[PDB]
Every structure is written in structure tokens, then in C-alpha cells.
């Protein structure tokens, strides 16, 4: 029961920081944030949901 | 001839040039180029690639550009037969040839003007002794020992040409050489570790041979990425990282 927030507050953590550090594009030409882009580019329009894509996710934290 | 280090006889001779690179098409020759290339954009030498797939458009190509250019790189391709002669060049030409194929033929071996090989002779190598193979009544006494001479060469051949096989990839030679002048990084050691597994996936070498190569490979692979001991937590993620494993023999499988 105190466990439960416990560890949601741990994961709602590591669920934030993927979004905040992932990226894409290789060293030679150039990165990209890929999902903090795309969050203020579909904020900004007016249409509030990204699309976040499983192997990204499994990628960063298995 | 056979070229005794690669500094001073090969590279610091085409430094200051405008060579022509011929290059055969099989994963080994271009993981052997990858590496030229990025040594040679690295001191500003001007050169040019011409991609050849056979022995009709490597001599349509050496036809065209034979007069500007008076050097020649050949990347896996005519180390197994004559070249003075397919291709008929002038004296002032100079020929590198960097190639597997093996047996080396003969009179490239003994022409130590035009044909230079950058070929290790510490492969497994046998080539015949100079004279064995190259130049009244006393005139037919001696000159019937001449022909026994002959005779004995016409044998020595069909024993040194009858078996084909392949020695240490191009891109292990070319990373030495490129490792000789200090200018080695992670890009040119994958370049060379793929040149190499490529011989060992289309069979053409042996596994007591592959796995001797693939012991040399380890020691430069711990030399560059071992120097991250215990910051490989402080290193960039985004930065090539080679590593040895002991993996299955499926294809594909991660795919």
C-alpha cells in the first residue's frame, strides 16, 4: 500500500526521462529529440497526444 | 618486388601524387577502399575511384586514363596473373597491387621496377628460386641441358599454379599501415574487422587461420575500448562502441 505510490513516484520518474532524453540520428550528421519535439509542435497547434512507439521504449529501458 | 614496410615505400612515395584506384566489387575490396579512402582524405591527396568487375572493363578503364595519371593502386584484383602484358603500359608506370588471390604469379615476383605488391610475405608463400624458372659439338652437349632446364621448368609450374587459395585480407593490411602512421580510430577498425569476417562467411579461408586473425584483432579492440575502464558511465552514449563476443552461428537472428 506505501509501496504502491513508492514505486509509482519511481516510475513515473523513468517513464519522464525518456521522454526528456531520447533521441535519434547518428553522430556524423546530427541528432534530434524526437519526442520533446513533437510534444511541443502538437501543443503549440492545439491537438495534445503524441505517439510514442514501443521498441523506442524498450531501447531506452528494457 | 615485395614492398619491405609501408611507410617509406608505399605511402610517402603516392603522398604527394594524384593516384587512380581500381577496385574490384566483393565486401573485402570495399572495406579495403573505406580505409584508402579515409587515409588519403586525411593528408589531402587527390585521387579517383574506378569501379572495375572484370578483366574487359579493367582494361577498357586503364585504355582512358593511361596518360594523365603514372600511378596505379589495384585492390583485389591481378596479383594471379601477368600485368605488363594485359595491359601494356609505359616504363615511368608504377603498379601497387594489394591483393588475396594467391598464388602471386611469377614474373610479378621477380619485375622489382613496375609491380610492387603489398603483399606480407609471411603468408603462406613458396614462390620457386629465381633461375629455376627464369634464363660444333658443345653447343647440343649444353644446350640439351637446356632443355632438360626446360623440361624441369614445365614440371615446377604445374607444381606452384595448380591450387588457388587466399590469404590475409586487404583491410588487415591496410590498417596496419594505417595503424604504422598513428591514424587509426574505431571507423577504420570496424572496416577491417568486417573485411575480415567477410572471407571467413563466404568460405574462403580456414578456421585455424580466422581464428588466428581474429586474436590479432582482439588486441586492438581492448587497446581502444578498454581505455574506458570505469567511465563507461561518463562517456557519450551516442559514440561507437566495439566489443568481442562469443555468439551463436544463426544469421540474422536479432533481425
Given at each position: 500500500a506505501d509501496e504502491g505510490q513508492a514505486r509509482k513516484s519511481q516510475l513515473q520518474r523513468r517513464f519522464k526521462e525518456f521522454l526528456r532524453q531520447y533521441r535519434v540520428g547518428t553522430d556524423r550528421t546530427g541528432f534530434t529529440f524526437k519526442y520533446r519535439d513533437e510534444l511541443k509542435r502538437h501543443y503549440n497547434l492545439g491537438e495534445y497526444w503524441i505517439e510514442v512507439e514501443m521498441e523506442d521504449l524498450a531501447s531506452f529501458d528494457e | 618486388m615485395f614492398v619491405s614496410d609501408f611507410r617509406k615505400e608505399f605511402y610517402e612515395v603516392v603522398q604527394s601524387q594524384r593516384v587512380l584506384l581500381f577496385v574490384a566489387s566483393d565486401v573485402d575490396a570495399l572495406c579495403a577502399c573505406k580505409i584508402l579512402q579515409a587515409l588519403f582524405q586525411c593528408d589531402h591527396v587527390q585521387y579517383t575511384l574506378v569501379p572495375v568487375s572484370g578483366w574487359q572493363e579493367l582494361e577498357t578503364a586503364f585504355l582512358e586514363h593511361?596518360?594523365?595519371?603514372?600511378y596505379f593502386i589495384l585492390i583485389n584484383?591481378?596479383?594471379?596473373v601477368d600485368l605488363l602484358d594485359i595491359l601494356?603500359?609505359?616504363?615511368?608506370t608504377i603498379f601497387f597491387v594489394c591483393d588475396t588471390?594467391?598464388?602471386?604469379?611469377v614474373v610479378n615476383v621477380y619485375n622489382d621496377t613496375q609491380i610492387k605488391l603489398?603483399?606480407?610475405?609471411?603468408?603462406?608463400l613458396e614462390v620457386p628460386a629465381y633461375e629455376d624458372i627464369f634464363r660444333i659439338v658443345e653447343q647440343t652437349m649444353r644446350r640439351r641441358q637446356r632443355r632438360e632446364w626446360e623440361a624441369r621448368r614445365r614440371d615446377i609450374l604445374f607444381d606452384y599454379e595448380q591450387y588457388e587459395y587466399h590469404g590475409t585480407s586487404s583491410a588487415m593490411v591496410m590498417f596496419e599501415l594505417a595503424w604504422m602512421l598513428s591514424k587509426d580510430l574505431n571507423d577504420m577498425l570496424w572496416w577491417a574487422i568486417v573485411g575480415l569476417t567477410d572471407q571467413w562467411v563466404q568460405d574462403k579461408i580456414t578456421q585455424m587461420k580466422y581464428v588466428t586473425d581474429v586474436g590479432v584483432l582482439q588486441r586492438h579492440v581492448s587497446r581502444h575500448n578498454h581505455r574506458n575502464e570505469d567511465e563507461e558511465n561518463t562517456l557519450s552514449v551516442d559514440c561507437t562502441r566495439i566489443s568481442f563476443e562469443y555468439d551463436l552461428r544463426l544469421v540474422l537472428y536479432q533481425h
Open positions: - | 593511361k596518360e594523365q595519371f603514372h584484383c591481378g596479383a594471379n601494356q603500359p609505359d616504363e615511368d588471390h594467391r598464388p602471386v604469379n603489398l603483399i606480407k610475405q609471411d603468408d603462406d
